[PDB]
Amino acid sequence: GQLKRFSLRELQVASDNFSNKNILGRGGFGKVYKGRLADGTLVAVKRLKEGELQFQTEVEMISMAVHRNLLRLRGFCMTPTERLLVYPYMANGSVASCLRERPESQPPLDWPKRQRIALGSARGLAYLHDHCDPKIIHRDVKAANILLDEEFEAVVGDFGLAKLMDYKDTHVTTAVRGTIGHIAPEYLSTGKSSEKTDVFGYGVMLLELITGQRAFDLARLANDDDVMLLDWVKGLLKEKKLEALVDVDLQGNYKDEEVEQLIQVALLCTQSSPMERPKMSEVVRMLEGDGLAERWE
């Protein structure tokens, strides 16, 4: 067919009585666990722990949303008790994981990998908002949330804050959750999410992916610069200097104008008025070479 009920225990054991050295992070309603299906497949299984059912809404997710820059749920578990979600294990983890927390002597993303994460993700995002009916609001775009396959392809993942609209185009009226540096001002101001807040989010991800930085650092604050990753970059303008903002670990390894364009973009996307942010798809065009230079003033 193509969608998998599991017999839990049969998965306890695929995660070795779960916890411990199985944790790929203390997840959002519990925890992401590493995992070898019965065959020897790798799955990141999500666990539930003690409102709710924003479950079912990502079970019924695939049956409305398949694109290959969107993580795809293998299967699930019901039981009278707890609830879990199997996604394909992503060999190379989040873009974040690749940027802060890179193990041994593990190598960091070079430009074009960065280039490719930018487009593919803009890509699945553009699908969600456009070629789905009801529209789909992701509500959680951040590097942490962009996964990477074996050939370092961006997969927008974690559908656990994800809301179907319909409700024409404007907004889904829903309680402001996520972390700080990823929330659109009006979202914050106003309770409502929306394709235009996914943008914002998305554009801040670019800045991550561009920078190394977290969207909101206290470390920065300890140096009289801005805790606000946006605001930092915009010390871009005056202090005319690329070099410092751009992720240290790329040195001779990008070219000046490649990076300008991509910044121009996150900037077009994080603008204050929703109205002027590119639609995710105009975002894709622009990544694909299509008409940025006027889209601004």
Curated annotation (Swiss-Prot):
UniProt PTM: Probable autophosphorylation on additional Tyr residues. Transphosphorylated by BRI1. The phosphorylations on Thr and Tyr are induced by brassinolide. Phosphorylation at Ser-15, Ser-19 Thr-170 or Thr-173 is not critical for flagellin signaling.
Outcome reported for the amino acid change (mutating A219E): Loss of kinase activity and loss of interaction with hopAB2/AvrPtoB
Effect of S15D: Loss of kinase activity
Phenotypic consequence of T179 to A/D/E: Loss of kinase activity
Annotated phenotype, changing R177A: No effect on some phosphorylation sites
Effect of N145A: Loss of phosphorylation
Effects seen without this gene: Semi-dwarfed phenotype, altered leaf morphology and reduced sensitivity to brassinolide and flagellin. Enhanced chlorosis and lesion formation upon pathogen infection. Bak1 and bkk1 double mutants are seedling lethal. Impaired SCOOP12-mediated growth inhibition. Partially compromised SCOOP10- and SCOOP12-induced root growth inhibition and reactive oxygen species (ROS) production; fully compromised in the double mutant bak1-5 serk4.
Reported impact of S19D: Normal interaction with BIR2
Domain Protein kinase: 18-297
Catalytic residues identified in the record: D140 (proton acceptor)
Tissue specificity comment: Expressed ubiquitously.
Quaternary organization: Interacts constitutively with BIR2, thereby preventing interaction with the ligand-binding LRR-RLK FLS2. Upon infection, pathogen-associated molecular patterns (PAMP) perception leads to BIR2 release from the BAK1 complex and enables the recruitment of BAK1 into the FLS2 complex. Heterodimer with FLS2. Monomer. Heterodimer with BRI1 in the endosomes. Component of the SERK1 signaling complex, composed of KAPP, CDC48A, GRF6 or GRF7, SERK1, SERK2, SERK3/BAK1 and BRI1. Interacts with the P.syringae AvrPto and hopAB2/AvrPtoB, ERD13, PEPR1 and PEPR2. Interacts (via extracellular region) with MSBP1.
Biological role stated in the UniProt entry: Dual specificity kinase acting on both serine/threonine- and tyrosine-containing substrates. Controls the expression of genes associated with innate immunity in the absence of pathogens or elicitors. Involved in brassinosteroid (BR) signal transduction. Phosphorylates BRI1. May be involved in changing the equilibrium between plasma membrane-located BRI1 homodimers and endocytosed BRI1-BAK1 heterodimers. Interaction with MSBP1 stimulates the endocytosis of BAK1 and suppresses brassinosteroid signaling.
Other notes: Interaction with BRI1 activates both receptor kinases and the full activation of either receptor kinase requires transphosphorylation by their partners. This interaction in vitro is magnesium dependent. Instantaneous heteromeric complex formation between FLS2 and BAK1 and reciprocal transphosphorylation after binding of the flagellin flg22 ligand to FLS2. The kinase activity is not required for the complex formation.
Protein name: BRASSINOSTEROID INSENSITIVE 1-associated receptor kinase 1
Species lineage: Eukaryota, Viridiplantae, Streptophyta, Embryophyta, Tracheophyta
